[PDB]
Design a protein around this ligand. Structure first.
Ligand SMILES: O=C(O)CNC(=O)C(=O)O
Ligand SMILES: [Mg+2]
Ligand code: NI
Ligand SMILES: [Zn+2]
Length: 331
């Protein structure tokens, strides 16, 4: 078996290798990349997502989210308080203010220590889930707006045509902005490009050990767990690396910088935080290997997780038994 310790692998494709997305994903998995739940992809030195980022300030963040924490330093939930719309220009100015800016620090390690020590005493503001793309339409390789769709993958694999479309989202982050422990909708893959600014640190549990994370989570968030059999889909729960180590949960960590891609793999639980002002673009995708994970994916039926129009059809085809009760959580 390739990558038996489930380490995060880093790839350096040539411009020749960078022409065929599907085939490069298949290559990475032949080297065991998926076992980690997360891989880093450094694009060829010749490749650019777009010419410059000089004209992005007028993008609107219609619903900025203030991330308010409750709990203890290493075990907390966050809720999202809706704030008034601002442009990316205004947001960037906010992220750089004395109140929200990244603090003085030695290295990613000193910064990580400060994040986990101090996160809960602050409420950073995230621009999340904004429909759009910053890839130049002339960028032909690894353009997240031009990937093959999940609906076409399902159709090629299973012979059934379904409704739905699949488009990218932009995330604008600042210091301490946080992504809670989760897998993707329907345990899909994701791909994430950090377009500009400060880094993003990621924690990930190998897919083969995901259930151990879930079991710890049921113990750490006992009331959430009683309310919903898949409460991690609410994307509110945080657990520090110290707490994970204390409980024997296998995981890994890696820091993404501007200009790099990350791929998350089916059923790879991940979480993280932003080091300062940045902009990332992400989208879900599928391969033939995803189909079985889609069929087994846990669902939120308490009605908190509330998920896309396109997800309906996945549940309808892949999980016809769940499909009655699930859309009751959606309606
Ligand atoms: O970048 C973020 O804040 C969240 N993105 C993801 O969880 C992802 O790409 O899978
Ligand atoms: Mg603009
Ligand atoms: Ni994700
Ligand atoms: Zn739920």
């Amino acid at each position: 078996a390739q990558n038996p310790n489930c380490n995060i692998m880093i790839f350096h494709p040539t411009k020749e290798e960078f022409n065929d997305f599907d085939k490069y994903i298949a290559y990475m998995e032949s080297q065991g990349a998926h076992r980690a739940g997360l891989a880093k992809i450094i694009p060829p030195k010749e490749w650019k997502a777009r010419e410059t980022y000089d004209n992005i300030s007028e993008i609107l963040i219609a619903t900025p989210l203030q991330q308010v924490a409750s709990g203890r330093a290493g075990v907390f939930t966050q809720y999202h308080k809706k704030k008034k719309a601002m442009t990316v220009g205004e947001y960037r100015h906010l992220a750089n203010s004395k109140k929200y800016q990244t603090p003085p620090h030695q290295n990613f390690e000193d910064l990580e220590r400060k994040y986990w020590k101090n996160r809960i005493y602050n409420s950073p503001i995230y621009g999340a889930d904004i429909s759009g793309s910053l890839f130049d339409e002339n960028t032909k390789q690894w353009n997240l707006g031009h990937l093959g769709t999940i609906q076409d993958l399902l159709e090629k694999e299973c012979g059934v045509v379904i409704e739905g479309v699949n488009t990218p989202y932009l995330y604008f982050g600042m210091w301490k902005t946080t992504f809670a422990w989760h897998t993707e909708d329907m345990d899909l893959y994701s791909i994430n490009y950090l377009h500009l600014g400060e880094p993003k640190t990621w924690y990930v549990v190998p897919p083969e050990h995901g259930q151990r994370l879930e079991r710890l989570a049921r113990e750490l968030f006992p009331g959430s767990s009683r309310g919903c059999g898949a409460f991690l889909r609410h994307k509110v729960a945080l657990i520090s690396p110290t707490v994970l180590k204390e409980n024997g949960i296998p995981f890994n960590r890696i820091t993404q910088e501007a200009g790099e891609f990350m791929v998350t793999f089916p059923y790879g639980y991940h979480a993280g935080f932003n080091h300062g002002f940045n902009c990332a673009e992400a989208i879900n995708f599928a391969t033939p290997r995803w189909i079985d994970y889609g069929k087994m994916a846990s669902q939120c039926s308490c009605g908190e997780a509330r998920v896309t129009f396109s997800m309906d059809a996945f549940v309808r085809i892949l999980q016809p038994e769940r499909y009655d009760l699930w859309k009751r959580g959606q309606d």
